[PDB]
């Protein structure tokens, strides 16, 4: 599978020995060319407009367009202090893309930092990492030092008078830190409770200053747009969502990996033509398109293009586009129990519905797994799923938490009904009081 | 000069639609058994001729009553301290019919003149220690220090010294020193206060045996006991 630079702008400079690309090898393979063009010939607002009309969308899972988000920055010249943050947390299960781009191609991330910080007029940039990526941390720090001693980082970058400083902030292992406002709160050294909007991070984000939070994949997509042009980027895929995307399947398949495809590729091609289909002796049961925080889909949804609108019309989220396949050998009750246990133990504890309803669903599913269900069980689960959607909770961790539960209840209700064995018994008897036998 | 206190609270003839204001809530309990250990006969309820409140629940404590004195916050469905939201015109603002209290004086149109009595700078003289007042929230008040609950929160009676003054006296932190004021020799242990100016000594006003009038006075024959 050849990767020409025209159709694979992100991963065409990968090395076959799983070794990182350093500064000289990156610059030989057309490196820092979009950086040079943006810093020399383009105004920051021109770069923002180019990103806006190039159709680039956010790859963190929200699908928000980055040009529109960059247009929310204040035009006041009194607030020259500005921060640009990378959500290199990548703590969502089933997501392994940012590790792949930022363990063996850090100079692409550094170039995206420089370009976006010049376009946002950001005087500082941080990469909010995770504590479990040691090799990625070492590679990012080495690449940052190399770009510093090559004159691409620091004061008076390439004789343009723009001073940009890049830092790496290694996290301490909490899933809610992936949320952008909670990422800002964790960057300041507080407990990572997220923040309400409005105000957005663009108006007043990190330390009250204007701040732009972006994914690793989007900041890696930016220098390709700045180098090879905008009309090339619009012609990569003939879909509403433009540009290439890291998609791939995982879980009991022949080739669980990671590939770069244009948008609109149907989920069967990424399952059969790329992942090799499912493993020997295992037939297909379900799949998550976005990982742990999305709705399950059946076999009939495999012939669907992996776009935001197509999956959204199908009743789910594209997410990180890293699908996981579930065979029939795995019980749905056990899988949903594991998902809800992860989501309950990674709650931040700010707002009541998530904090004191995810453990309830955890206990209900644990009772279902051992066959200790009672009447009124699935009713309580769908009650929680109805009253944990968007808007009810403070942040979007709980809608993504209750998405797989309601999806597996809708599509696989017969497996949940098998665990209901015991009759309902909440109160033990008391000698000397006749109970109120409700009919 | 004290003519304002007539408007502080309404007199004892003030009634809300003919009735007085209740002191205790309407669900007050035990009325026929609080005094049963003394005698089973129910006594006369105490009559409050001085004020407009009554010593019973036969009164008015409605949130919409036209008054400024509220004995307690209670609304139907709000037994918490959140009944004050029902007792206000708007939440977080004033009371519904004005806050109690009347200003004794207004702002004068013309002010005073500049006080020319500029004091000279403090000179630490030998043998005399100027008393720096260290007030405490728990202990300085005359009545609050007599509370037995405050004695656990009561700080130990400690005298504060500059490091230079402590080095001059040869005393450390915690050792006992004795000083006499108005023919009263008392002994206290020592803390070392860094920010204190030298030539002074710090005393806790309102303590047991230490009057608050000692602030700004001079201390003689301070020595290690």
């Amino acid at each position: 599978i050849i990767r020409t630079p025209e159709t694979h702008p992100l991963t065409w400079r990968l090395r076959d020995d799983k070794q990182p690309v350093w500064l000289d090898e990156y610059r030989s393979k057309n490196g820092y060319e979009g950086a040079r063009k943006a810093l020399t010939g383009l105004s920051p607002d021109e770069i923002v407009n180019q990103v806006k009309d190039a159709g680039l969308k956010g790859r963190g899972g929200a699908g928000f367009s980055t040009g529109l988000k960059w247009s929310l920055m204040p035009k006041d010249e009194s607030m020259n202090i500005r921060y640009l943050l990378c959500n290199a947390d990548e703590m969502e299960p089933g997501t392994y893309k940012d590790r792949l781009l930022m363990e063996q191609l850090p100079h692409l991330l550094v170039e995206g930092m420089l370009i976006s910080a010049f376009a946002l007029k950001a005087y500082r940039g941080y990469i909010f990492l995770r504590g479990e990526y040691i090799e990625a941390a070492v590679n990012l720090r080495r690449a940052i030092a190399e770009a510093t001693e090559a004159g691409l980082l620091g004061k008076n970058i390439m004789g343009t008078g723009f001073d940009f400083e890049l830092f790496v902030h290694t996290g301490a292992g909490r899933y809610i830190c992936g949320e952008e406002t909670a990422l800002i709160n964790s960057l300041e050294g507080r407990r990572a409770n997220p923040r309400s909007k409005p105000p957005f991070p663009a108006t007043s984000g990190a330390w009250g200053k204007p701040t732009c939070v972006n994914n690793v994949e989007t900041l890696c997509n930016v220098p390709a747009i700045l180098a090879n042009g905008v009309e090339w980027y619009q012609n990569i895929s003939k879909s509403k969502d433009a540009g290439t995307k890291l998609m791939g399947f995982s879980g009991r398949v022949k080739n669980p990996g990671l590939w770069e495809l244009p948008f609109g590729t149907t989920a069967r091609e990424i399952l059969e033509d790329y992942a090799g289909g499912m493993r020997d002796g295992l037939k297909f049961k379900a799949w998550q398109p976005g990982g742990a925080g999305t709705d399950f889909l059946t076999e009939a949804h495999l012939d669907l293009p992996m776009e935001f609108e197509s999956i959204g019309k199908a009743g789910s989220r594209l997410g990180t586009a890293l699908a996981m396949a579930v065979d029939h050998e795995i019980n749905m009750v056990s899988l949903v129990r594991n998902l809800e246990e992860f989501f309950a133990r990674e709650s931040c504890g700010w707002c009541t519905p998530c904090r004191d309803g995810l453990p309830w669903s955890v206990k209900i599913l644990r009772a279902l797994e051992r066959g200790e269900g009672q009447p009124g069980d699935i009713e309580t689960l769908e009650q929680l799923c109805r009253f944990l959607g968007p808007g009810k909770t403070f942040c979007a961790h709980a809608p993504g938490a209750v998405e797989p539960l309601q999806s597996a209840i809708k599509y696989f209700r017969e497996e949940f009904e098998a665990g209901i064995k015991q009759p309902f018994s909440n109160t033990h008897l008391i000698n000397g009081i006749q109970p109120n036998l409700l009919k | 000069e004290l003519a304002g206190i007539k408007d502080a609270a309404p007199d004892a003839t003030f009634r809300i639609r003919g009735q007085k204001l209740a002191r205790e809530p309407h669900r007050y309990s035990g009325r026929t058994a609080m005094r049963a250990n003394i005698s089973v006969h129910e006594p006369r309820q105490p009559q409050d001729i001085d004020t407009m409140f009554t010593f019973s629940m036969e009164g008015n404590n409605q949130p919409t009553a036209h008054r400024s004195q509220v004995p307690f916050a209670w609304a139907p469905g709000w037994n918490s301290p959140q009944a004050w939201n029902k007792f206000q015109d708007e939440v977080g603002g004033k009371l519904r019919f004005g806050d109690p209290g009347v200003r004794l004086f207004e702002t004068s149109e013309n002010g005073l003149d500049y006080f020319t009595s500029v004091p000279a700078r403090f000179q630490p003289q030998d043998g005399k220690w100027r008393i720096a007042p260290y007030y405490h929230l728990f202990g300085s008040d005359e009545l609050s220090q007599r509370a037995p609950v405050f004695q656990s929160r009561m700080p130990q009676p400690y005298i504060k010294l500059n490091p230079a003054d402590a080095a001059k006296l040869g005393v450390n932190a915690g050792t006992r020193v004795s000083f006499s004021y108005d023919g009263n020799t008392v002994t206290l242990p020592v803390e070392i206060a860094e920010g204190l100016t030298a030539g002074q000594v710090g005393l806790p006003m309102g303590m047991s045996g230490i009057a608050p009038v000692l602030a700004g006075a001079h201390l003689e024959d301070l020595k290690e006991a």
């Binding site: 990548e90 703590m91 969502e92 299960p93 089933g94 997501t95 392994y96 940012d98 590790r99 995770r130 504590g131 479990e132 990526y133 040691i134 830092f167 902030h169 290694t170 996290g171 301490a172 292992g173 909490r174 899933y175 964790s186 960057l187 300041e188 050294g189 507080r190 407990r191 990572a192 330390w207 791939g248 995982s250 879980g251 009991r252 669980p256 990996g257 990671l258 990982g291 742990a292 890293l322 996981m324 579930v326 795995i330 056990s334 899988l335 594991n338 998902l339 992860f342 990674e346 | -």
Partner: protein, 156 residues
């Protein structure tokens, strides 16, 4: 009694030079103390609070909020296994059973010699090569229950 080392204080100051607010170096200060001493003792909260100028309350809240900061003493190695959804699909349960059979302890406990401490952890980002385990700084993929005691004998 806890007293911070000169190297720890120098690293904390060099880290707080990076941010505009000294509070932002709390996570890195706690991680530096954790790297130097294995875990974060009780006096470390007061020491980091006195260095950073922020109260000990929010430092303790940060140390208790994050799962990778240990407020209880652990063994010489911290074996963390991914209990998430994809490793459940790939069968981390056999790996956990093999770990409990070798170490003779439940997850969340430490071995009686202070050698290993077994803990479930979040997604390790290696779902395509699951199941995955994480000893102190090294991750391992494609785990089998029979290879667990061979893998754990290279950590003294």
């Amino acid at each position: 009694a806890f007293e911070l080392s000169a190297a720890e204080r120098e690293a904390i100051e060099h880290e707080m030079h990076h941010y505009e607010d000294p509070r932002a170096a709390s996570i890195e200060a706690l991680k530096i103390v954790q790297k130097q001493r294995g875990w974060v003792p009780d006096g470390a909260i007061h020491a980091i609070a006195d260095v950073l100028g922020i109260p000990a309350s929010d430092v303790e809240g940060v140390a208790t909020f994050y799962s990778q900061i240990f407020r209880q003493p652990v063994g010489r190695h911290v074996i963390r296994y991914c209990d998430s959804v994809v490793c459940h699909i790939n069968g981390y349960q056999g790996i956990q059973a093999a770990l409990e059979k070798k170490l003779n302890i439940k997850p969340g406990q430490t071995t009686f010699d202070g050698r290993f401490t077994l803990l479930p952890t979040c997604c390790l980002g290696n779902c395509d090569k699951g199941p995955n385990m994480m000893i102190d700084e090294d991750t391992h993929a494609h785990l089998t229950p029979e290879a667990i005691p061979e893998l754990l004998e290279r950590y003294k």
